[PDB]
Amino acid sequence: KVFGRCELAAAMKRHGLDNYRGYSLGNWVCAAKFESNFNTQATNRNTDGSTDYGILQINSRWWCNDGRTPGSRNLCNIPCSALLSSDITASVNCAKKIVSDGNGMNAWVAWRNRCKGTDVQAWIRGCRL
Fold first, then answer.
1. Which residue of 57, 63, 85, 129 shows the fewest CB atoms closer than 10 Å?
2. Catalytic residues
């Protein structure tokens, strides 16, 4: 499923992402906008044997189990394909696990690159929240 900027804002908000670990709602819409394009079915295949999955692009070597990624941990207890459905629960759930440990949304390269220290309050402007 491919989200529209506000229904993704409203959905991420449904799921308690607004202000989770000190990052406002727009910080998330932004990472997801630049990582996948609100495309929950996106898949990228890095160098190292890992692959990135869904709307947020979570990495198979720390976070999920697709079983073809060595050096695999399974910190989210999730198959990487649960990350590609249309409901963002699994992805939100695995996003909180990530962000929680100790680096923050710095975990996401695209937020680092294109959202970090920018007026992110502008990816939620307009939306009923």
1. 129
2. 35, 52
